[PDB]
Amino acid sequence: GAMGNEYKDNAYIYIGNLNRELTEGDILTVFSEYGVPVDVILSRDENTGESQGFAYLKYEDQRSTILAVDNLNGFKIGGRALKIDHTFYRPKRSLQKYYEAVKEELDRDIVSKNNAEK
Amino acid sequence: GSKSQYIDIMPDFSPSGLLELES
């Protein structure tokens, strides 16, 4: 019940009820099984930088997103299970480097290159 | 703007130690 049904462009998924020690890479570890995340963001505080217990992940393919919403939902991680829903929010401009720094690590695999830079 | 570091947060990218036991 955290869906943003305003679109069907909801490649972003709400990952709620996460534990504190769960980081972006962790989320990627479980979610990459269901596809390739092109964007992922862990909702973490701007001061201390600690997880709020929420995340947003976006697969390349929204159908992969759907499979995660269902089949990865209810996976127990450290006493609590994670929740997936179709959320859509506009990425923050203030914290943009967090977003782009994340996709860089993902894009590494996504971009097929014989030559990366000229 | 800040020229020390971009944002102070930045992503971590690691598994949790929960995960290794939970899966």
């Binding site: 099984e33 596809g35 393919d61 159908r63 919403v69 695999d109 | -």
Partner: protein, 33 residues
């Protein structure tokens, strides 16, 4: 992280991304038909 199975046995033809260590996990939620 590595692609273990090269067989698109997945209904969605999705193959595990390069950050999947190789731990197959699923809950088995029947919500999605």
């Amino acid at each position: 992280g590595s692609y273990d199975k090269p067989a698109p046995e997945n209904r969605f033809a999705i193959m595990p991304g390069s950050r999947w260590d190789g731990v197959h996990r699923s809950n088995g939620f029947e919500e999605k038909w």
